[PDB]
From a paper:
The structure of V3 [name] with fH was solved to a 2.3 Å resolution. Despite sharing only approximately 60% amino acid identity, the structures of the fHbps are well conserved (Root Mean Square Deviation in all atom positions (RMSD) 0.65 Å) and so is the structure of the complex with fH67 (RMSD 0.91 Å) as predicted on the basis of the similarities in distribution of amino acids critical for binding to fH revealed by mutagenesis. We determined the first structures of the entire V3 [name] and the C-terminal β barrel of V2 [name]. There is a striking conservation in the overall structure of the V1 and V3 proteins despite their relatively low level of sequence identity. Although amino acids that contribute to high affinity interactions are grouped in the same regions of these proteins, the precise interactions required to achieve the same affinity and overall interaction with fH differ. Direct comparison of the [name] V1 and V3 structures in this region did reveal a difference. The presence of an Arg106 in V1 [name] pushes the loop away from fH in order to accommodate the long amino acid side chain. The presence of a Pro in V3 [name] brings the loop closer to fH and allows the side chain of Gln107 in this variant to hydrogen-bond with the fH, consistent with mutation of this residue in V3 reducing binding by 25-fold.
Numbering used by the authors:
A (entry chain D): 81 to 126, 126A, 126B, 126C, 127 to 210, 212 to 321
B (entry chain A): 324 to 443
The structure:
């Protein structure tokens, strides 16, 4: 963890080696990650600064303490703080933020307790739509949410049919398993392979999931899903790989 | 059926993934963020935008937030106080100083404080 925050990038590391955090840095401010006495700050502007994911364990969530800051009238104030969760794969990563506290609107130098969980972004070598293999592929990995890091992802993609489906299992905060309904595989603006569809409780629609394909042969998937139970929105980080 | 949301002073998270799937059916929702100097109606930098029968909800996803600046030649009882778009605050200047054009209050507008909180 400490090494990921201080040590530089080397080829000898088990990939994904480098990860950019632009989507986790709000209001053109800074993000500071801290773990095991180490610290690193990320500014919204530059894309050259990145997290050394090569030092982190593969197929596991790495937890760093986070603080999102903004500069106002010479003074720098804390926008939010909590736990930064990173799930690492060989060619991909899923970033989620467990917000514990936000800036006190009445006393800006202080903080108020407000809990929210957001899947803020992804990272890795995206699969080009023209790099899709033939036939089918199966993916297995993690599903994680607010105080729920042991869910499982099962996912199948028919490349010929340009379609995928799957399931999220073992999420304690969710009454049923979440069905990842049959969805269309499309090319996005950068010609990368993506899937987006419905999340269900059996046949009943509850939200949306979307996945991006990673690696030159679509070895991995990484994305996010939502479940709406009444008025509460549950955000879920999902990532899998071909076994 | 809601088309891609034009979130003024914000935008969607995972924009690249979500963009090819518009329009979305009623009941669909997406996580969104607010830019610098802006915030969600809940007072956070992010929330969810919903596709309702009346269109996208919240209707105004991103609201201006104005921080009260340090006043040279003014009283600093409101320094580092956050005000949301539409809210006004009295400006207390030191004797011999005033807000320009005989103003007594500043208001948080879509583009910041109006007028600028300054004791000449």
């Amino acid at each position: 963890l400490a090494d990921a925050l201080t040590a530089p990038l080397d080829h000898k590391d088990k990939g994904l080696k480098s990860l950019t955090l632009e989507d986790s840095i709000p209001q053109n401010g800074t993000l500071t990650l801290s773990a095991q006495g180490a610290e690193k700050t990320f500014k919204a502007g530059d894309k050259d600064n990145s997290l050394n994911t090569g030092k982190l364990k593969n197929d596991k969530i790495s937890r760093f303490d986070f603080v999102q800051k903004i500069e106002v009238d010479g003074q720098t104030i804390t926008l939010a703080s909590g736990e930064f969760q990173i799930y690492k794969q060989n060619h991909s990563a899923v970033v989620a933020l467990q917000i514990e506290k936000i800036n006190n609107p009445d006393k800006t130098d202080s903080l108020i307790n407000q809990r929210s969980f957001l899947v803020s972004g992804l990272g890795g070598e995206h699969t080009a739509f023209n790099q899709l293999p033939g036939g089918k592929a199966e993916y297995h990995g993690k599903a994680f949410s607010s105080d729920d890091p042991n869910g499982r992802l099962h996912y199948s993609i028919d490349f010929t049919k340009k379609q995928g489906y799957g399931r999220i299992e073992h999420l304690k905060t969710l009454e049923q398993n979440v069905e990842l309904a049959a969805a269309e595989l499309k090319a996005d603006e950068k010609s990368h392979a993506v899937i987006l569809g419905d999340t269900r409780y059996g046949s009943e629609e509850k939200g949306t999931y979307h996945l991006a394909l990673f690696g030159d042969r679509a070895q991995e998937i990484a994305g996010s899903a939502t479940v709406k139970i009444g008025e509460k929105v549950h955000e879920i980080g999902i990532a899998g790989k071909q076994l | 059926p809601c088309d891609y949301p034009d979130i003024k002073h914000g935008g969607l998270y995972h924009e690249n993934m979500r963009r090819p799937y518009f329009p979305v059916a009623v009941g669909k929702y997406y996580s969104y963020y607010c830019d610098e100097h802006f915030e969600t109606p809940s007072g956070s930098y992010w929330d969810h935008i919903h596709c309702t029968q009346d269109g996208w909800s919240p209707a105004v996803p991103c609201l201006r937030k104005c921080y009260f600046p340090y006043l040279e030649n003014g009283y600093n009882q409101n320094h580092g106080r956050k005000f949301v778009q539409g809210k006004s605050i009295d400006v207390a200047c030191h004797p011999g100083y005033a807000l320009p054009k005989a103003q007594t209050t500043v208001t948080c507008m879509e583009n910041g404080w109006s007028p600028t909180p300054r004791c000449i």
